[PDB]
Design an enzyme around this catalytic site. Structure first.
Site, short mmCIF file in Angstrom:
data_model
loop_
_atom_site.label_atom_id
_atom_site.label_comp_id
_atom_site.label_asym_id
_atom_site.label_seq_id
_atom_site.Cartn_x
_atom_site.Cartn_y
_atom_site.Cartn_z
N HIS B 41 -25.21 -29.48 -2.81
CA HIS B 41 -26.18 -30.02 -3.52
C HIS B 41 -25.90 -31.16 -4.22
O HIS B 41 -26.51 -31.54 -5.22
CB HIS B 41 -26.54 -28.82 -4.58
N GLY B 143 -19.73 -31.13 -14.26
CA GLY B 143 -19.11 -31.94 -13.21
C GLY B 143 -17.96 -31.43 -12.89
O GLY B 143 -17.28 -31.97 -12.19
N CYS B 145 -18.12 -29.02 -10.56
CA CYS B 145 -18.43 -28.03 -9.02
C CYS B 145 -17.51 -28.94 -8.19
O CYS B 145 -17.39 -30.25 -8.36
CB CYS B 145 -19.69 -27.97 -8.84
#
Ligand SMILES: N=C(N)NCCC[C@H](NC(=O)[C@H](Cc1ccccc1)NC(=O)[C@H](N)Cc1ccccc1)C(=O)CCl
Ligand SMILES: *CC(=O)[C@H](CCCNC(=N)N)NC(=O)[C@H](Cc1ccccc1)NC(=O)[C@H](N)Cc1ccccc1
EC number: 3.4.19.12
Lengths: 305, 304
Positions: B41, B143, B145
């Protein structure tokens, strides 16, 4: 969200770890530039530890008796010195992975990451607090000596601890990288017992702020108090006194949450006197005191290195 | 002596973490050989996440849109594919610092070390357990991921988790390195709730064994209980059932302790009902279930 006991990335320290052997005794060392640091009792027999004349036994040996090994590579000792309880071994080769570093002496209540090593190989890393009695409640087995504790100050690895000895209580004691012991301890097998411990109150308050940042609010009341009324209560529960400088250091978390330091001192006051109501705070049923105010900011602010 | 929740040394994984930026979205990626893995994503905008279609969204993008950064050196992206929920970016150069590695899918109950990273730089390392409900109680900010969990088998870094998402609960959810989510979660802004969680019985027992090896023995009793009978008290207290496979894996610590697995099950059973008697066990007033039986040996056997 979330809050865990978090250690600094250990990569930069892993690159400085080596094995130091003297006679039949082996342990870990810290290889920075062209000098290896290690506890000076590597040169001692078990017989020697009953009354060790480190000054005499140091000069009785020479470079060839020290076998430094960086992984599979043998490092040639070309000079040996003694700075207090830390033996410095000058070597032929300088470490290419030497980080930008500094030797710092921490104060009781502060924290650091410990990289536990054996035979010069890292085994695991964890966060330790330097207790008020100058011990650390670590996890160490035989061969763990020379394991170092450190912080990463932005762009610099600050070394603050090198492990030397386990005491009978099961807690641990060591030196700074200058070879000075934290606490009244000796690299000698003589009767040594840690002093009475206390709870680092400023760290507990920081850990309650952390719980507020992460949603937990059940322990917050509508009370406040004075800094001395709380310290009267703190002393009763063998809690360290809270100074004005401590309140200063909790500002950033007081500012982030909108809760005055003394408002949360009142909340802690009543947590001490009436218990935790069988409830959890950040996954613990006890008051945790191994998180400094900077540890809470660092974790709830995403600091990087 | 001593028992703390320690993580594996992170050095080998630190060398593999990079910053992946696509459009306005930046997260972390894993750089192994000539490939950079990251949560898919990254390609979406916040407005896209309400109902993303990743295959068409990748139809829109080119290697020119994917900016990879290894520190301050920019890595040329020369190909981009997708495996389930993970995006694979093929890059012009292979990572000099690639360790011997495996991709593994752990089962609920085992532990791993997480290297929390932001903008491709590591920030901290801690131990996690994959809960029975396929969540993890980690520490992740925005931030984060791309951060990965991992074990270290001697000299083999077996990655098992990549962080993708935080749920309203505050718990965390992610995928194995083949892009397959743990649990019934998906990379979409949809109603998703973690199933109700249970305590990992086998780990608590291992933790109790660690406590006695380290000298804590007040919880001992041994009233001779049966596997079943224990399980019926356990399930009422939201502890997962204890099979005899579990009993087998606690064998080693049952040995060194000289305590039969079932007789500690007894002392756990009344610890479960009576209480903690206002006492501690290795510094905890709670029963700790995030220590595997191997975690206890590894920490009591000086493995490197
Ligand atoms: N520095 C930042 N933040 N850069 C931009 C990176 C954003 C990146 N992703 C995110 O922030 C993801 C996006 C997402 C992922 C999966 C499903 C749904 C949404 N956001 C989240 O997971 C939010 N918790 C939103 C949410 C709430 C409840 C349920 C599901 C999702 C990130 O933080 C990982
Ligand atoms: C860090 C070490 O384990 C190191 C032994 C290196 C050899 N390698 C292996 N055995 N695998 N040092 C010690 O173990 C340490 C030596 C010492 C003795 C006395 C003072 C300071 C250091 N041994 C201990 O600490 C024992 N716990 C003895 C002791 C010391 C102080 C008080 C009570 C007992």
């Amino acid at each position: 969200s979330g809050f865990r006991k978090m250690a600094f990335p250990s990569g930069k320290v892993e690159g400085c770890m080596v094995q130091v052997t003297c006679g039949t005794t082996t342990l870990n060392g810290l290889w920075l530039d062209d000098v290896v640091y290690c506890p000076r009792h590597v040169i001692c027999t078990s017989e020697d530890m009953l009354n060790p004349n480190y000054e005499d036994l140091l000069i009785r040996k020479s470079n060839h008796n020290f076998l430094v090994q960086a992984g599979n590579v043998q490092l040639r000792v070309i000079g040996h010195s003694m700075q207090n309880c830390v033996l410095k071994l000058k070597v032929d080769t300088a470490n290419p992975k030497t980080p930008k570093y500094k030797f710092v002496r921490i104060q009781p209540g502060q924290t650091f990451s410990v990289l536990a090593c054996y035979n010069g190989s890292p085994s695991g890393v964890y966060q330790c607090a330097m207790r008020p009695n100058f011990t650390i409640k670590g996890s160490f087995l035989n061969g763990s000596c020379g394991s170092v504790g450190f912080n990463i100050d932005y762009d610099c690895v600050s070394f603050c601890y090198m492990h030397h000895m386990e005491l009978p209580t099961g807690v641990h004691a060591g030196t700074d990288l200058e070879g000075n012991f934290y606490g009244p301890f000796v690299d000698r097998q003589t009767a040594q017992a840690a002093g009475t411990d206390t709870t680092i109150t400023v760290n507990v308050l920081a850990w309650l702020y952390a719980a507020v940042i992460n949603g937990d609010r059940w322990f917050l009341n509508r009370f406040t108090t004075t800094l001395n009324d709380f310290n009267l209560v703190a002393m009763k529960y063998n809690y360290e006194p809270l100074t004005q400088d401590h309140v200063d250091i909790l500002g950033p978390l007081s500012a982030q949450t909108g809760i005055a330091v003394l408002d949360m001192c009142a909340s802690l006051k009543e947590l001490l006197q009436n218990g935790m109501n069988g409830r959890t705070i950040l996954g613990s049923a006890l008051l945790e005191d191994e998180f400094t105010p900077f540890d809470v900011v660092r974790q709830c602010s995403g600091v990087t290195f």
